[PDB]
């Protein structure tokens, strides 16, 4: 009938139908289990909480993410989220819809193979496909040339594409994304005396990060600005009514994207990783890659992150090239939007991994067809 | 009918653009390298040259804002595919993205072979079968004009006597006596400039009777022998 | 019926109609194929890139020349260039036009036989002819006496002609031309740290050849001038914005023409090859040949090439002859220009190889008629 | 490239200290396949090519297919995105650029040196690949001494101990006059 587009990120699940312009279901990719003692009869019958109900009852739960750094680490909890996606949030029978799934590059091969076997044997989909997330972000931009910087909850990765051809040797992947920024904001919030330890309190710090944090155009003068004045101070009200104030941690947290040494990592920032990915490409295609730096994912939604990238790559570029970052306001769903474009094309209808092909080749068919 | 000169346009592109509009494509082609990029006009011209087109494989001009370029790129891939196998054109190094990007050389490499096929089909339905010839169609006008009787008879298409449109307007009313209309014709008092007006005066009514003439008036004022034979080939079909 | 003049050399294709004074189509004779992985649907449909398009998208292609040293080595890719020439660049049906083709002297006989078979059995031309390039370059100068130095991309050859008579025993041929100067410039550019390896980077070095290289009048004083001062230094901007500087390689690259031992060849330079060809001619026609040295081809376009040939031959000549080098500004199209002159002559209309003659004698007809 | 293809099994090495671990894995477990397409089919069926390696922290990683796909980049440089030809074709192309009279002696003396020529099966593969490119009446002979890793040093101690070499040194007096450019003349 119609195809399902499911983008399983580390943090959020984006699901919907091919041909729409926005996902129908966006809920956190968590599973919660009660950690206290049930005393009222008839109220402890529920063994697990999955979607937004795991988030609303998080005070009495321990929260687990099945996906970490793009790799599915819990396969029983992943089937819970897929059951929640198909039957509760989209309310469709998966046996009638081909399903399009997404994955990051440079990812273990058993990950792609297991989600193929899950969809065919547990959910019994007629066909499926696994696409690369950065390729789909280029579909959403209406482009066939450009280097994509995708930064979500688990993985930051770069994929150069020129005229619809990918250069895999230039694909660069960094395991630094939003969940690592949230954990660093927790670590530096203790400097002002605010302590967040519980997995439920980690969801609070993520809410603080998405509201008050921003990228400084020049990091060393924001530090001098915040040291002398209090014009960067901002307040946040906790769920119990307490009020916390941060002035310096607002831009020290996203600065880990450009200085990964803040969290003790030896890697280079996202500006140098993009430039190094371009310099691994043929000298003829570099001018077009400099002019199409496509941004994607929720970790690129900080205020002032495209101004900071445009300034940092310009300092590394040969001063004759013109640098252009395309950061659309719909960045958070570019991977999903591009997936619904791809699954709607009639030229794509012969590239599904049909169940017939899976029955004769097994779960390894996904490596040849994707 | 539009007869205007653009600031930059070669005579080759004017002939192709005029042939498209005179053939009845649903849009009005104003720029070749800007109106063919969705391949809808090209797919329309395939029907005019007896090439079957499966319209269930074509994306209709109402395009979603998301994935519109991929919708148009699929059309250009279908147009190039139809040019190779069933149309038997020679399209070497040409893909769908060349039409979609408006490549000037590779767009003209396809449309000139469409026009050549269209003219070839005009020269074959005039006869019984797979025969196409020029001197069979030059004595036909010298014969059908004897029914009324006028002092217009040409040897071949290279004759300079058809420099003015007096010879072609002499034939335009022989088939249809209801289009006499010698009000604006010129005879003996014509310079090089004023015969452009009657050349348009002669070509314009050819579509009124039913002769689907796709030649420019400039192709008639000068004695370009390949385009003037199309005028008489298109007039024969309306006549007989 | 207007005749077609296709002068396809090792480097470029020159095509047009007999009667015009300049070729209508001048594009590189290359065929590119994608070397990378196609990821976006609707973009991997093109298998071959032929004309200037292969030069536009060379970043993702491997570029192959079908012609090497005047000899067609890839007959499947040579038909692609001819199909592209007739249908895309000229937009004519070959079945209605006699075709004039060119070829270098002392060339394998199967090359001329097989390009006669292609023209008759694949393109179905009404008639065709194969002409020697150095003879056509003499029509273009309006002469009937002279010795031609033809230097293109693959072959350098000398042909002496007197009163319209060729002296075949004095015909020289040196397999050292523009392409071998490109490969030498790539090799000596690494002395400054500039590395060019791929087939797409060879096109960048060829571009540096045609814009910055010149012929030294006296090689040993230019070498001492460039060593001391810095006035011969020049800069060039690469496609990605990097700036390279060369000061000494400008005149050492074309010096390989006069000292073929720079690339490990035992042959003599072009100045001693044209002189050896004169000394193989009859003593009575030598004075006329000394005063008509006709240069043609792109490799004769270096600044100072004609003043150096004048000086070098004068040192070998008997000091009472006067040496005259004829280097018209239209040198690059002399072979094409002279072929449009020849194909326009009414005397020539009985010299075509018609299809009826080919149908009774096969491809070998070309050896007796040309 | 071994680091890049180790992530297919879930082994992530990203730091400059972890690159020294991957170098150690390469030198101990990698080998050149005589026929690449048969070894790929062999590893895809059984697990007799699997081998284990213990990391400095005690973790045990297993590779079965990356063992010969890593040195295969020498013969197929397109694995790492390069357009160049393999070391067997580059060696053959160097011979074909030489005088036709000296090619028979070059075919019979193919000397390898350096650490990257120390993979098991590298000389058998070069022997087989050049033979397929040679005119079938020549004798291909690869010379791979067990002391390959120090051939450059060993030959430099032979050269520097010769008495005829003692006039080929660039002395300090020569450098004091011509400057650092003296090295281009004498060497
Ligand atoms: N406006 C925002 N500012 C800063 N961070 C944000 C914003 N919106 C979302 N995020 C972060 O982005 C991450 C989710 O991004 P997303 O692309 O949905 O991840 P995934 O690819 O795993 O679904 C979360 O870690 C969240 O904290
Ligand atoms: N201005 C220039 N200076 C020096 N060399 C040139 C110049 N223009 C072209 N060339 C050389 O001429 C060659 C092409 O010449 P051409 O006469 O077309 O050869 P062919 O007859 O083989 O096609 C190229 O290899 C290029 O290096
Ligand atoms: N037994 C082995 N098998 C495979 N590779 C090896 C082996 N021993 C050394 N190597 C590789 O060869 C290189 C040895 O360095 P060497 O040959 O001395 O190079 P260089 O001359 O540049 O110093 C190292 O990079 C190492 O990775
Ligand atoms: Mg994502
Ligand atoms: Mg030439």
Numbering used by the authors:
A (entry chain C), C (entry chain A): 5 to 374
B (entry chain F): 388 to 627
D (entry chain B): 188 to 374
Reported in the publication:
Here we focus on human T-plastin, a member of the plastin/fimbrin family of tandem calponin-homology domain (CHD) proteins. T-plastin is a 70.8 kDa monomeric protein that functions as a key actin network stabilizer, strengthening and promoting cell protrusions by localizing to lamellipodia and filopodia. While most cross-linkers bridge filaments through the dimerization or tetramerization of subunits featuring a single actin-binding domain (ABD), plastins contain two ABDs (ABD1 and ABD2) within a single polypeptide chain, each composed of two tandem CHDs. They also feature a flexibly tethered N-terminal regulatory domain (RD) consisting of two Ca2+-binding EF-hand motifs, which inhibits bundling activity in the presence of Ca2+ while still licensing binding to single actin filaments by unclear mechanisms.
We obtained a 3D reconstruction using IHRSR as implemented in RELION 3.0 (54) at a global resolution of 2.6 Å. Local resolutions ranged from 2.4 Å to 3.9 Å, radially decaying from the core of the filament, facilitating direct atomic model building and refinement for the complete sequence of Mg–adenosine phosphate α-actin and T-plastin residues 388 to 630. Despite using the full-length protein, density for only two CHDs was observed. The map resolution allowed us to unambiguously identify them as CH3 (olive) and CH4 (dark green), constituting ABD2 and a short segment of the CH2–3 linker (light green) at the N terminus of CH3. The essentially uniform ABD2 decoration in the dataset indicates that when T-plastin engages F-actin, ABD2 must bind first. The robust actin binding by ABD2 furthermore indicates that Ca2+ suppresses T-plastin–mediated actin bundling by inhibiting the subsequent actin binding of ABD1 after ABD2 has engaged, rather than downregulating initial F-actin binding. Like many other ABPs, T-plastin’s CH3 domain of ABD2 engages a major site spanning the longitudinal interface of two adjacent actin protomers, which we term actin I and actin II (numbered from the plus/“barbed” end of the filament), while CH4 does not directly engage actin. Helices H1, H3, and H4 constitute the actin-binding surface (ABS) of CH3, mediated by an extensive hydrophobic interface between H3, actin II, and actin I’s D-loop, as well as salt bridges between H1/H4 and actin I. However, CH4 undergoes an ∼30° swing around the CH3–4 linker to avoid a steric clash with actin, licensing a major rearrangement of the short stretch of the CH2–3 linker resolved in the cryo-EM map: a 180° flip away from the actin filament. In our high-resolution actin-bound structure, CH2–CH3 linker residue W390 engages a series of hydrophobic residues along CH3 H1, suggesting a role in mediating the docking of the CH2–CH3 linker after ABD2 initially engages a filament.
